[PDB]
Amino acid sequence: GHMHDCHQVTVSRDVTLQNKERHDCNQVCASIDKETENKLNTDIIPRLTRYMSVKGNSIIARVQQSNSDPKCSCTWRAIIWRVYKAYDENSLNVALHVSHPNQQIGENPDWSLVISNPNVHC
C-alpha cells in the first residue's frame, strides 16, 4: 500500500472569442494558440515552478471542437508531471491569480488547474 508524495496537475486556459462571422471554432481558437503557449511558458509554468518536485510538463494542446457558434469556447490543457502533494488543488489554483501578496487585481482569470492523477512519485 505504498504512499505517494507528489500529484499530477493539468493546467487549462478557457477563453471565449467573438465569432460574429460564424467561422470554424477550431480556426477562431487557433488565432491565439501561440499567445496561449507564450503565456504558458512566460507566466503560468514560472509561477508554478515553485511547487514542482522536478521541472516537467507536456506541450500545451488545444481541444478540437466541431462548431461555428457565435461565441467560440476555446480550451488548452498542459500536464505538469510532478507537484508535491503538500500543495492542494486550491492553493495551486490561487497561485494562478495571485503572486505579490494582499493583491486585489487577480490575473489569469482564463486559467484553471486540476489534479489529473492523485498518485505520482518525485
Numbering used by the authors: 1 to 122
Paper passage:
The structure of AvrLm5-9 was solved using iodine single wavelength anomalous diffusion (SAD) signal from a derivative crystal and then refined at 2.14 Å resolution using native data. An elongated peptide (residues 54 to 64) runs anti-parallel to β-strand 2, but only establishes a few main-chain H-bonds, and therefore is not categorized as a β-strand. One face of the β-sheet is covered by the long connections between the stands. AvrLm5-9 has three disulfide bridges, which are C3-C119, C22-C69 and C26-C71, named SS1, SS2 and SS3, respectively, according to protein numeration without the signal peptide or C22-C138, C41-C88 and C45-C90 according to protein numeration with the signal peptide. The SS1 bridge knits the N- and C-termini together, while the other two disulfide bridges fix the long helix onto the β-sheet. The two last polymorphic residues were mapped onto the AvrLm5-9 3D structure. The mutation leading to virulence towards Rlm9 is situated in the middle of the long helix, and the mutation having no effect on the interaction with Rlm9 and Rlm5 is in a loop connecting β1 and β2. Neither mutation is expected to perturb the 3D structure.
The Dothideomycete Leptosphaeria maculans, causal agent of oilseed rape stem canker or blackleg disease, is one of the fungal pathogens in which suppression of ETI by the presence of an AVR gene has been demonstrated. Surprisingly, despite low sequence similarity, AvrLm5-9 and AvrLm3 are structural analogues of AvrLm4-7, sharing an anti-parallel β-sheet covered by α-helices. Structure-informed sequence database searches identified a larger number of putative structural analogues among L. maculans effector candidates, including the AVR effector AvrLmS-Lep2, all produced during the early stages of oilseed rape infection, as well as among effector candidates from other phytopathogenic fungi. These structural analogues are named LARS (for Leptosphaeria AviRulence and Suppressing) effectors.
